[PDB]
DNA sequence: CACGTTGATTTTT
DNA sequence: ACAACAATCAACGTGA
């Protein structure tokens, strides 16, 4: 199957949708061959088919099983009467209509009538125009619903008016309704969308169309639109509980550093003060885990503890001291406001009231709180019989004692909730359900905050990822996915505000990315992450959004070695890629639907080219497999939308310059993608031949491989020879001789001097092959193949620079004649052929040697190499490599065409 | 020459920009293997080959504004330190440091090329400039050279194990030309001699300047105007088209064809122009500025006045 | 009264520090109106003080009559630039550095000792708009206007060729109703007798633009497939 | 300190000797030859079991009397630092690949110029010297060193550079002897270069790597 | 503002 | 025969 077939057939449920499954089994793979290569006609027909099928489910009588087939065929033909029944015959058989139903040629009159009156000698088989009624109104609904551009385009007059009078003529008593979310922040935007979906289905709404910022629904006519103040509290509880359980499990909101365990500002809001202290024994059992070099001996050394106490501790210095010291540290640092009510508790809820005086537990410098590492090491020395797991069973009970004790005394605050308030205001600016009241935004506050961003009357920095229209706070190593503390143009110049700002909205989003992508905090940028965003061609059907869920949660981590292997095999037909296992019934049904469908690369090498090789391939590939539109960028913030973005199928924001050197456009139409994939796989299959090692692709050298291919096209054969040298193989396969030549013809395609040099290197060898032919079956050496060209080049290089071209032609042809007469007679095509008189064999040999030598001295040396021996000496090696590949190609072409 | 041009310039540095531009038209010729890199490759961009309506695109080397302005700028600061107008010592009253809080607010570099401390002052660069482009294609204009770094005992092996210290690096070739316009707003006469000084006196650019990267700045004309004249890209695309792509020409034919292409362009651009110093008037102007930069008394005088003018601007209108 | 269709071609790479994420600084794909308004009319109309010192050196003067670098001078000149639509674009991500002027250099951590203040120490990557780009804007004025055929924009004062045509009275027409603007439009410059019904937004300093909007009010159909808001002026919402 | 460093902790230091790629005064075609080299078994033949070794290849080598004009430049030296760098220029004699077998050269210092900034490129001195000879490059090394001296002085009078001292000819062949007298004297050299060590160690503790 | 301090990630047939 | 590099480019906390 194709990847698009594979994803789509999962979304169906056979008990009463089998006819749409017959289409995906047979017409769909032919559809994306003819129509697959702005917008693509295969993705238009697929969304049109699916949307009419979803409209059909509402009809109060079931459409006949014969008529469902007419809809499925008619909706494919619609992009183009005896003068049209033949254009239906040609196109149907190309599209394998036969396999959907063999019967179709009977109904071709109807199938052509639904795709464009009088019968013209072709009478309709379907009983009466009461069956053409639902068919024609279904077909004309899909082919306008898929041309909407935003959820508002059904309340805006341009296409929405006709969608209502169509639905009325279909007798459905449902009504179009929408949601839209104008502001598009990543996972938080996806969560908001999927909570509105999960809410409105309880009103019996059913989504009909999906867009990058929203949904259109068929919803009943007698339903209340959900209240603004209610979907606010629902969507906050959704996001705050889903992130809540993640912080409670410890995979987000906590970070280890040198001053001990830290907690994110938002953890302090989303968990009550009593919750965090009950979770700490489990987060230390995840975040405090270095058994190779734990903190306690390092901390105790800088305490200078001495006094014959040191050995009581040091013989038990272990990870199980750290975990307790880190817990006591974070509770002291964040939970209790004055220390003395709590140092007196821990020193008696543990048995250390005597050994350690209250004030000697607070010793610190630079926040490192050395004193608790002494406390923990006494409790761990006294109970030294424990292992790590029976210790964690202690510390879980110690935390729950601390939690209960703190709240019976009331020693912790009901901390503020600022991210709820700014999130309720984020919803009030940027979320709309159809029939909500709306206000003009006060953009003055967004300017006023910028005008003061570098002035003392701004308390926290302005957001680095947005405009600063919502309250912001300093970036944290435990919140953001990258370095918090680098130079900012937004912070005042020469000020002490060295940390950048983040909006409280983007702070939840970075934490949702830690929680739901499972990426590092403050360190994800060093994985060189490039993000591919799979935007719609305006509209997706519900089955396509389910298909894109099965992709973005299930896609295989690409390895280019076997993508190479399955394309040099299959003779470079790019259609082979359609069938490969790109993934790992639906399996991701519990995950949220991707409204902004993001997939990302991770690299461990340090260069920009090492980052881009998989994203650039995937960003061409997914539009070629699924008809989606891809933008590849380094930005964790996604691109803000407009109708100008859609004017190309792919964008690649700032590819390593190998892209531009190859002359591939950094934005591509659907007509450009198969040229581009051919050039990208051609450069990968040449780089993985030379400048690679079998386990190490060395993508840091792809800029050296491209610059050589572009400078002079014969380097394609110089690299093929290096690959033969690494593989320790003495000659290319028959496949390699046409592969590396189709690559040279591909990279030369636009250039006059390269097409001239590639035509010259063939002509050069095709000329000496008139008088010399070593048979490749005898396993000859690279030198034996190049005997006349090596003796031509050595002549040009050895003579004084004063001597004429017409002297070189004579001296070198003498050396060719002298060399040929020392080889065995079977190698000499003109002399071995006894059919003609001896002086005429001599005369034909002499003029064949002369014309070859004239091409070497006139065209190879004089014109191409500028008549300069320095410029020839640099090329001697690649001219030789190019001529060996030319000789083997001319021989492979001869041994075929001689039949 | 210089005695006639003294009328054109401002008599002292103005507060507001007045729209007097003196434009230096140059060909920067590569002399030994410069490396204009960022991100580990020679910087390149796709461009149209020339102005005459081509379908034909061309990858050309780009020398960014930073890569040419900073080597000019820093060659001025070391001259001012050698004249003793500024100092490197943290205990001196005329300290200037290139980027931090310790930047001066008075010296010629700070007023002509600008500074930004924060609230304690900033000044806009009066030397305007553009990113320069190779006249020919990247495929014609570069070569890649291997480097290695063995043990001092002459061997890639030490103690029986190999060093990983080999790689390629990418270099521009010893005849590649980068057509350039540098432009100076609202300058005093001595401000023009300081900046024109930097253009003629600095000689190395790009990475590895300790070992490579000499360029010859051939000045081709000076043009006094009410406004911005044309871009480096537009001059380069005009110059390629005047040659029809026969890029293999000697330095003096390439400079004289740039002098007539500059005048062909200046006639079309809508700004009024007071003076057009080209040819034998430029070669006498260049001799008359070379004569300042070779004389200890004359140069200490002019640059002393520049200092005073910029110290006076600083105290009257500048950052005090 | 007069309208000029101005298309901007980048003759070197343009950078604005629109957003920052770790080592990466990036440029939004729309040129903000107020940036282009000073690029066109600063020195010709708006004053251009070479130096700043004080609060005036880090506080904008966009719409403050008390300061010289106002965009309000242009309200009185009867001129208004709209923001810029990208017709064709590309990005280059290029590193930039601090110079080691001294013979000896230590790589210092930002915020470390000798590095405790916000300055461009170390290195960063700028996502610039590239030479391979073209943008479209409109200037509307009440007087024939001597527009400069070259402008400079952004963090590095980068050259743009402006090629400009006055849209003649034979091909514009004036109307009023509901219209899809389809050009970018700045919400701060929106007067009374315009109201914004729908918008799609591009979040950007100093203030967000609309990339697409539906408006109710007066307009000029300047060619058969674009509609430009009439009566916009700098800061009209204040 | 003088030639710089950049590996590991404790920073990086820029070379105070500034150098550039040098060019042959003549064309490649008059200035090189290709020589075959082979490697037999010690038994004196290219076979050890009847089979061939085939260990035969070409390499290109620059001919004798081929001349490379160049300017080495030294910034911010002490007097002892000048004696060290100048010592390297007079005391080195092998250059290319395969030092063990090849690549001796004769450095004739033709001038020393004290200066406020950079003078001409290597390529420019080469292109001036070729023009002054008219391309008639088969002239003896004494005439070639005397032609380089007059073109270097012609070019220096066209450079925007204050020239404090211009040591050429009879003053330079005085100075070259006064420096040979350092490098042939065990006490004088130890003292001078020992002072340099202190100067460079004090630079290191005051401004460099501490 | 100026002193002090020192843990983390997961992997490219 | 055998290497394709090698390093460096904060993130807070606390007291005055």
- Give CA C217 to chain center in angstroms: 24
How far apart (Å, rounded) are the C-alpha atoms in residues A848 and A845? Answer: 5
Query: Would you call C98 an interface residue with chain B, using a CB distance cutoff of 8 Å?
Result: yes
Return the residue in A870, A874, A875, A876 with the most chain D beta carbons within 10 A, the one to mutate for interface testing: A870
C43 touches chain B (CB under 8 A): yes
Residues A423 and A181: their CA atoms lie apart, in Å, by 13
Query: Is the distance from CB of A669 to CB of A642 less than 8 angstroms?
Result: no
Q: What is the DSSP letter of B223?
A: E
CA distance A719 to A740: 9
The token pair at A58 is: 């509402």
Which nucleotides of chain E are near protein (any atom < 7 Å from a CB)? Answer: 1-13
Give the whole-angstrom CA distance, residue A626 versus residue A636.
24
Using a CB-CB cut-off of 8 Å, the residues of chain A touching C89 are 667
- Can you count the helices (H) and strands (E) in chain B? 9, 16
Nucleotide nearest to B40 (CA to C1'): F5
Min Cα–Cα distance to chain A from B284, Å: 38
Helices A752-768 and A734-747 pack at an angle, to 10 degrees, of 150
What's the rounded Cα separation, in Å, for the pair A291 and C18? 44
d(CA A185, CA A86): 51
Measured CA to CA, the distance from residue A788 to residue A768 in angstroms comes to 7
Which pair of structure tokens corresponds to residue B54? 């081509």
Cβ–Cβ under 8 Å, residues C235 and C188: yes
* Cβ distance of A466 and C237 shorter than 8 Å: no
Contacts of A520 (CB under 8 A, 6+ apart): A481, A514, A527
Three-state DSSP string of A306-354: CCCCHHHHHCCCCHHHHHHHHHHHHHHHHHCCCCHHHHHHHHHHCCCCC
- At C197, list the tokens: 């019904």
Chain breaks in chain A (C to N over 2.5 A) after: 37, 80, 116, 584
Give me A454's structure tokens.
Answer: 């570098």
Query: What Å distances lie between residue A606 and A487, A611, A612, B40, C196, CA to CA?
Result: 21, 8, 11, 11, 47
Nearest nt to the CA of A365 via C1' is E4
Token readout for A155 is 């309340």
CA A595 to chain centre: 16
Q: Can you say whether the dihedral through the CA atoms of B197, B201, B203, B205 is positive or negative? A: negative
CB contact under 8 A, B144 and A708: yes
What's the CA C112/C1' E2 distance, rounded, in angstroms?
Answer: 12
Strand A650-652's sheet: what is its strand order?
A598-601, A530-535, A629-633, A650-652, A667-668
For nucleic chain E, give residues with Cβ below 7 angstroms from it: A 256-259, 287-290, 293, 295, 298-299, 302, 365-368, 496, 518, 520, 523, 526, 557, 559, 561-562, 565, 602-605, 694-697; C 112, 116
- Determine contact, residues A502/A479, Cβ cutoff 8 Å: yes
Q: How far is D61 from chain B (nearest CA, A)?
A: 18
Residue D9, Cβ density class (10 Å: 0-12 exposed, 13-18 middle, ≥19 buried): exposed
DSSP single-letter state for residue A440: -
Q: Please state, in angstroms and rounded to a whole number, the distance separating the CA atoms of residues B15 and C48.
A: 8
Touching A (3+ Cβ pairs <8 A), the chains are B, C, D
- Count the Cβ atoms, other than its own, within 10 Å of residue A263: 21
> Measured between alpha carbons, how far is residue B85 from residues B76, B295, D114 in Å?
11, 17, 21
Place of tokens 């570098």: A454
CB B204 within 8 A of CB B11: no
DSSP-derived pairing of the beta strands C24-26 and C123-129: parallel
The residue of chain A nearest to residue B115, with distances taken between CA atoms, is A493
Q: Do C93 and B125 touch (CB under 8 A)?
A: no
Q: How many CA atoms lie within 13 A of A589 on its CB side?
A: 5
Structure tokens at D112: 């020393």
Instruction: Tabulate helix, strand, coil % of chain A (nearest 5).
Output: 55, 5, 35
Whole-angstrom CA distances from A367 to A154, A330, A371 are 59, 11, 11
Give the residue among C122, C166, C185, C157 at the shortest CA–CA distance from C1: C166
| Residue D178 to residue D109: CA distance in whole angstroms | 14
What are the beta bridge partners of residue A409? none
Q: Are strands B166-172 and B121-123 parallel, antiparallel or unpaired?
A: unpaired
Q: Which two tokens stand for residue B316?
A: 């009257």
CA distance A344 to A324: 17
Distance CA A688, CA A691 (A): 7
What's the CA gap between A317 and A381, in Å, rounded? 8
Contact flag B318-C53 (C-beta cutoff 8 Å): yes
* CA atoms within a 13 Å half-sphere pointing along the CA-CB vector of D171: 8
Residues of B in contact with D117 (CB under 8 A): 75, 78-79, 201-203
Of D41, D64, D168, the C-alpha closest to D111 is D168
Q: How far apart are CA A232 and CA A433, in angstroms?
A: 12
Is residue D163 within 8 A of residue B295, CB to CB? The reply is: no
The neighbour count for residue C114, using CB atoms within 10 Å, is: 10
Cβ proximity of B77 and B292 under 8 Å: no
Closest C-alpha among A444, A634, A449, A446 to residue A527: A634
- The string over B137-153, giving b where at least 16 C-beta atoms fall within 10 Å of a residue's C-beta and e elsewhere, is bbbbbbeeeeeeeeeee
What interhelical angle do D122-132 and D141-156 show, nearest 10? Answer: 120
Check B59 against A495: CB less than 8 A apart: no
Q: Is C155 on the interface with B (CB under 8 A)?
A: no
How many residue pairs bridge chain B and chain C with CB atoms within 8 Å of each other?
Answer: 127
Token output for A7: 């994803």
Rounded distance, CA A456 to CA A462, Å? 12
Burial of D198 (0-12, 13-18, 19+ CB in 10 A): exposed
CA torsion through residues C15, C17, C21, C26, sign: negative
- Residue in B112, B87, B113 with CA at minimum distance from that of residue B102: B87
Smallest Cα–C1' distance to nucleotide E3: which residue has it? A366
Which ranges of A171-294 does DSSP label H, i.e. alpha helix? 186-200, 228-249, 267-270, 273-287
Residue A538 has a CB neighbour count (10 Å cut-off) of 19
Count how many residues are written for chain A: 899
| DSSP assignment of A660-719 | HHTT--SEE-TTTHHHHHHHHHHHHHHHTTSS-BTTB--GGGHHHHHHHHHH-TTHHHHH
Q: Cα(A105)–Cα(A116) distance, rounded to whole angstroms?
A: 17
User: Contact, B172 vs B61, CB < 8 A?
Assistant: yes
How close does chain C come to B309, measured CA to CA in Å?
15
How far apart, in whole angstroms, are the C-alpha atoms of residue B62 and residue B49?
14
Spanning CA of C98 to C1' of F8, the rounded length in angstroms is 14
In angstroms, the CA D16 to CA D85 distance is 10
DSSP code at position A860: I
Q: Are A777 and A894 in contact (CB under 8 A)?
A: no
Residue B29 token pair = 């010729």
Rounded to whole angstroms, the Cα distance separating B238 from B247 reads 13
Contact check, Cβ <8 Å, D13/C107: no
Q: CB-based contacts of C200: which residues, under 8 Å, 6+ apart?
A: A150, A182, A213, A641, A642, C210, C211, C212, C213
Name all contacts of A776-782 with Cβ < 8 Å and 24+ positions apart: A776/A731, A776/A888, A776/A891, A779/A730, A779/A731, A782/A880, A782/A884
Q: How far apart are CA B216 and CA A136, in angstroms?
A: 76
In chain C, residues preceding a discontinuity (C to N beyond 2.5 A) are none
Burial string for A273-296 (b: 16+ CB within 10 Å, else e) reads: beebbbbbbbbbbebbeeeeebbb
Cα angle B125-B130-B135, degrees, rounded to a multiple of 5: 155
Tokens of D156: 């220096």
* CA atoms of C138 and C144, how far apart (whole Å): 14
Task: Report the C-alpha gap between B8 and B186 in whole angstroms.
Answer: 10
Three-class HEC string of D101-149: CCCECCCCCCEEEECCCCCCCHHHHHHHHHHHCCCCCCCCHHHHHHHHH
CB pair distance less than 8 Å for A465 and C20: yes
Structure tokens belonging to residue A85: 């029944």
Q: How far is B9 from chain D (nearest CA, A)?
A: 22
User: Which of A700, A690, A575 minimizes the C-alpha distance to A625?
Assistant: A575
Q: How far apart are CA A134 and CA A141, in angstroms?
A: 11
Q: How far, in whole angstroms, is CA B259 from its chain's centroid?
A: 18
Q: Cβ distance A693 to A687 under 8 Å? A: no
Q: Nearest to residue A296, comparing CAs of A327, A315, A312, A319?
A: A319
- Whose tokens are 């992009």? That residue is A79
Note whether B135 and B236 are within 8 A (CB).
Answer: yes
Sign of the CA dihedral A615, A617, A618, A620?
Answer: positive
B203 CB near a chain D CB, below 8 Å? yes
Q: Do B293 and D20 touch (CB under 8 A)?
A: no
Instruction: List the 786-845 stretch of A: residues with Cβ below 8 A of D.
Output: 797, 801
Tokens of B95: 């300290």
Note whether B118 contacts A: Cβ–Cβ < 8 A. Answer: yes
- CA distances (Å), B306 to each of A335, B24, C52, in order? 63, 20, 21
Neighbours of A410 (CB within 10 A): 7
Strand ranges in A493-601 using DSSP code E only, listed in sequence order: 501-503, 530-535, 598-601
Dihedral sign computed on CA atoms, order B154, B156, B159, B160: negative
In angstroms, the CA A93 to CA A76 distance is 13
Q: Is the peptide bond before D141 cis (omega within 30 degrees of 0)?
A: no
- What are the φ/ψ torsions at residue B317 (nearest 5 degrees)? -125, -25
For tokens 């057939």, what's the residue? A9
For tokens 């009253």, the residue is B93
**Bridge partners of C124?**
C96
Residue ranges of the alpha helices (H) in A356-387? 371-382
Give the separation between CA A524 and CA A521, rounded to whole angstroms: 6
CB contact set of A301 (below 8 Å; sequence gap of 6+) = none
- How many whole angstroms separate alpha carbon A512 and alpha carbon A191? 10
Distance between CA atoms of residues C16 and C36, nearest Å: 12
CA A501 from chain centre, in angstroms, equals 28
Burial of A454 (0-12, 13-18, 19+ CB in 10 A): buried
Name the residue among A684, A461, A682, A715 with its Cα closest to residue A559. Answer: A684
Alpha-carbon distance values, A872 to A795, A812, A860 (Å)? 12, 16, 9
Tokens standing for residue A501: 């700002």
Question: How crowded is residue D116: how many other Cβ atoms within 10 Å of its Cβ?
Answer: 19
Contacts of A280 (CB under 8 A, 6+ apart): A327, A330, A331, A399
The half-sphere exposure of A280 on its side-chain side, counting CA atoms within 13 A, is 33
Distances in Å between the Cα of D110 and the Cα atoms of A889, B13, C22, D141 are 58, 46, 53, 12
User: Residue A74 and residue A107: Cα distance in Å, rounded?
Assistant: 11
Its sign, for the CA torsion D22, D28, D32, D35, is positive
- Other Cβ atoms closer than 10 A to B161: 7
Place of tokens 């590239």: C130
Experimental method: cryo-EM
Radius of gyration of chain D (CA): 22
Among A180, A122, A145, smallest CA distance to A55 is for: A145
The DSSP result for A281-300, as a single string, is HHHHHHH----SS-HHHHHH
> In angstroms, what CA-CA distances link A304 with A50, A299, A300, D190?
74, 9, 7, 48
Q: In a 3-state reduction of DSSP, which class is residue A896?
A: helix
Handedness of CA B53, B58, B64, B67 (dihedral sign): negative
Alpha carbon distance C11, C128 (integer Å): 13
Residues 6 or more apart in contact with residue B14 via CB below 8 angstroms = B186, B317, C50
- Please, which chains are in contact with C (at least 3 CB pairs closer than 8 A)? A, B, D
DSSP state of A778: G
What phi-psi label fits residue A780: left (phi over 0), alpha (psi between -120 and 50 degrees) or beta? beta
């Amino acid at each position: 199957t194709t990847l698009l077939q594979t994803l789509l057939i999962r979304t169906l449920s056979e008990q009463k949708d089998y006819i749409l499954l017959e289409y995906f089994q047979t017409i769909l793979p032919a559809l994306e061959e003819h129509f697959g290569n702005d917008q693509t006609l295969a993705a238009h027909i697929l969304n049109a088919l699916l949307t009419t099928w979803n409209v059909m489910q509402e009809l109060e009588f079931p459409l006949n099983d014969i008529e469902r087939r007419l809809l499925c065929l008619g909706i494919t033909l619609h992009d183009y009467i005896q003068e049209i029944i033949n254009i239906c015959l040609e196109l149907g058989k190309r599209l394998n209509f036969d396999e959907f139903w063999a019967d179709w040629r009977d109904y071709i009159a109807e199938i052509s009538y639904l795709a464009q009156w009088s019968n013209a000698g072709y009478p309709f088989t379907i009983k009466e125009r009461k069956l053409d009624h639902p068919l024609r109104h279904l077909l004309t609904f899909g082919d306008v619903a898929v041309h909407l551009s935003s959820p508002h385009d059904l309340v805006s007059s341009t296409m929405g008016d006709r969608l209502r009078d169509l639905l009325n003529r279909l007798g459905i008593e449902k009504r179009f309704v929408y949601h839209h979310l104008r502001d598009t922040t990543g996972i938080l935007s996806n969560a908001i969308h999927n909570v509105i979906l999960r809410t409105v289905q309880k009103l019996d709404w059913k989504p009909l169309l999906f867009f990058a910022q929203g949904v259109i629904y068929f919803a009943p006519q007698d339903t209340e639109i959900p209240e603004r103040n209610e979907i606010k509290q629902i969507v906050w509880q959704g996001i705050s509980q889903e992130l809540g359980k993640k912080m409670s499990a410890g995979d987000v909101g906590f970070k280890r550093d040198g001053k001990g365990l830290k907690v994110s500002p938002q953890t302090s809001e989303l968990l009550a003060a009593a919750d965090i202290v009950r979770i700490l024994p489990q987060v230390i059992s995840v975040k405090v885990n270095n058994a190779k070099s734990p903190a306690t001996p390092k901390r105790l050394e800088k305490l200078e503890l001495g006094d014959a106490e040191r050995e009581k501790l040091y013989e038990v210095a272990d990870l199980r001291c750290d975990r307790l010291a880190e817990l006591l540290g974070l509770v002291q640092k964040e939970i209790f406001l004055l220390p003395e009510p709590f140092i007196e508790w821990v020193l008696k809820d543990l048995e250390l009231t005597s050994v350690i005086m209250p004030e000697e537990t607070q010793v610190q410098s630079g926040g490192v709180n050395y004193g608790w590492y002494r406390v923990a090491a006494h409790y761990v020395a006294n109970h030294a019989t424990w292992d790590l797991e029976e210790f964690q069973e202690f510390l879980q009970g110690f935390g729950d004692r601390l939690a209960t004790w703190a709240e019976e005394e009331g020693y912790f605050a009901e901390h503020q909730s600022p991210t709820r308030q700014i999130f309720e205001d984020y919803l009030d600016r940027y979320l709309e359900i159809q029939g909500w009241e709306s206000d003009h935004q006060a953009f003055i506050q967004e300017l006023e905050n910028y005008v003061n961003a570098k002035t003392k009357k701004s308390k926290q920095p302005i957001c680095s990822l947005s405009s600063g229209e919502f309250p912001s706070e300093d970036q944290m190593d435990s919140v953001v996915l990258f370095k918090p503390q680098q130079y900012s143009n937004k912070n005042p110049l020469g000020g002490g505000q060295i940390k950048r700002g983040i909006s409280k909205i983007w702070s939840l989003e970075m934490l949702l990315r830690q929680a739901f992508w499972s990426v590092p905090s403050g360190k994800f940028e060093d994985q060189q992450p490039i993000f591919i965003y799979l935007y719609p061609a305006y509209v997706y059907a519900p089955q396509v959004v389910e298909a894109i869920r099965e992709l973005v949660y299930g896609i295989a981590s690409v390895n280019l070695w076997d993508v190479r292997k399955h394309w040099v095999n299959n003779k470079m037909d790019l259609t082979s890629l359609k069938s490969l296992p790109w993934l790992n019934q639906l399996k991701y049904t519990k995950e949220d639907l991707p409204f902004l469908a993001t997939v990302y690369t991770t690299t461990r090498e340090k260069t920009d080219t090492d980052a881009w090789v998989k994203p650039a391939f995937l960003a061409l590939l997914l539009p070629y497999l699924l008809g989606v539109k891809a933008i590849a960028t380094r930005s964790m913030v996604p691109l803000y939308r407009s109708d100008q973005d859609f004017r190309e199928s792919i964008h690649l924001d700032g590819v390593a310059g190998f892209w531009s050197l190859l002359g591939i456009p950094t934005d591509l139409r659907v007509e450009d993608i198969t040229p581009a994939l051919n050039k990208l796989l051609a450069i990968y299959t040449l780089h993985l031949a030379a400048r690679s090692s079998p386990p190490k692709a060395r993508w840091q050298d792809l800029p050296k491989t491209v610059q050589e291919v572009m400078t002079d096209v014969l380097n394609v054969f110089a690299l093929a020879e290096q690959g033969l040298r690494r593989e320790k193989r003495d000659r290319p396969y028959e496949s390699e001789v046409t592969e590396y030549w189709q690559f040279a013809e591909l990279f030369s395609q636009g250039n006059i001097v390269m097409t001239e040099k590639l035509k010259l290197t063939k002509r050069l060898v095709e000329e000496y092959r008139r008088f010399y032919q070593v048979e490749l079956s005898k396993k000859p050496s690279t030198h034996a193949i190049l005997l006349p060209l090596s003796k031509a080049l050595e002549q040009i290089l050895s003579v004084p620079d004063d001597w004429d071209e017409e002297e070189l032609i004579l001296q070198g042809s003498g050396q060719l004649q002298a060399a040929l007469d020392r080889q065995e007679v079977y190698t000499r095509p003109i002399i071995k052929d006894k059919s003609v008189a001896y002086e005429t064999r001599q005369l034909q040999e002499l003029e064949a040697i002369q014309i070859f030598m004239t091409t070497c001295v006139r065209d190879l040396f004089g014109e191409m190499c500028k008549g300069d021996r320095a410029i020839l000496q640099e090329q001697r090696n690649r001219i030789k490599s190019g001529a060996e590949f030319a000789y083997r190609l001319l021989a492979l072409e001869a041994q075929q065409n001689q039949n | 020459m210089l005695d006639s041009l003294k009328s054109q310039f401002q008599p002292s540095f103005p507060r507001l920009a007045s729209g007097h531009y003196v434009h230096f038209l140059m060909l920067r010729h590569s002399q030994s293997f410069p490396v204009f890199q960022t991100d580990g490759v020679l910087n390149t961009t796709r461009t149209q080959a020339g102005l005459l309506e081509k379908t034909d695109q061309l990858s050309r080397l780009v020398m960014f504004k930073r890569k040419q302005t900073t080597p000019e700028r820093l060659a001025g600061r070391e001259l001012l330190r050698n004249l003793g107008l500024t100092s490197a010592d943290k205990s001196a009253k005329n300290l200037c440091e290139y980027n931090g809080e310790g930047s001066c607010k008075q010296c010629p570099d700070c007023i002509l090329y600008g500074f930004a401390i924060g609230d304690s002052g900033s000044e806009r660069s009066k030397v305007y400039s553009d990113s320069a482009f190779s006249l020919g294609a990247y495929e014609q204009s570069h070569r890649s050279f291997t480097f290695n770094a063995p043990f001092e005992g002459g061997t890639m092996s030490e103690a029986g194990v190999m060093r990983s210290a080999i790689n390629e690096l990418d270099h521009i070739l010893p005849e590649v030309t980068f057509p350039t316009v540098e432009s100076l707003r609202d300058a005093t006469y001595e401000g023009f001699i300081y900046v024109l000084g930097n253009l003629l006196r600095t000689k190395r650019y790009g990475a590895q300047e300790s070992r490579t990267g000499t360029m010859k700045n051939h000045l081709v004309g000076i043009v006094f105007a009410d406004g911005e004249i044309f871009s480096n890209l537009h001059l380069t695309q005009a110059l390629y088209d005047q040659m029809g792509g026969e890029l293999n020409k000697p330095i003096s034919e390439l400079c004289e064809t740039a002098a007539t292409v500059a005048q062909d362009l200046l006639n079309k651009e809508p700004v009024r122009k007071s003076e057009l110093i080209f040819g034998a008037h430029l070669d006498t102007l260049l001799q008359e500025v070379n004569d300042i930069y070779q004389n200890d008394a004359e140069l200490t005088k002019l640059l002393g006045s520049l200092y005073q003018q910029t110290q006076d601007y600083a105290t009257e209108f500048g950052a005090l | 009264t007069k309208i000029y269709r101005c298309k901007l071609t980048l003759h070197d790479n343009v950078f604005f520090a629109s957003r920052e994420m770790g080592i990466l600084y990036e440029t939004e794909k729309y040129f903000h109106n107020w940036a282009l308004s000073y690029a066109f009319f600063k020195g010709t109309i708006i004053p251009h003080p070479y130096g700043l010192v004080g609060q005036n050196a880090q506080t904008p003067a966009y719409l403050d009559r008390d300061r010289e670098q106002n965009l309000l001078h242009l309200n009185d000149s009867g001129i208004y630039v709209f923001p810029a639509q990208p017709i064709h674009w590309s990005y280059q991500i290029n590193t930039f550095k601090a110079a080691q002027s001294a013979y000896y250099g230590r790589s210092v951590q930002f915020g470390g000792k000798g590095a405790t203040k916000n300055y461009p120490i170390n290195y960063g990557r700028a996502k610039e708009l590239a030479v391979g780009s073209e943008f479209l804007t409109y200037i509307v004025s009440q007087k024939e206007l001597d527009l400069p055929v070259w402008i400079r924009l952004g963090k590095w004062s980068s050259k743009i060729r402006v090629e400009v045509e006055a849209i003649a009275p034979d091909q514009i027409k004036t109307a009023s109703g509901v219209y899809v603007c389809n050009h970018p439009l700045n919400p701060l410059d929106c007067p009374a007798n315009q109201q914004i019904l729908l918008y799609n937004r591009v979040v950007m300093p100093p203030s967000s633009l609309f990339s697409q909007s539906q408006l109710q009010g007066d307009y000029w159909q300047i060619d058969r497939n674009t509609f430009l808001p009439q009566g916009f002026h700098y800061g009209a919402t204040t």
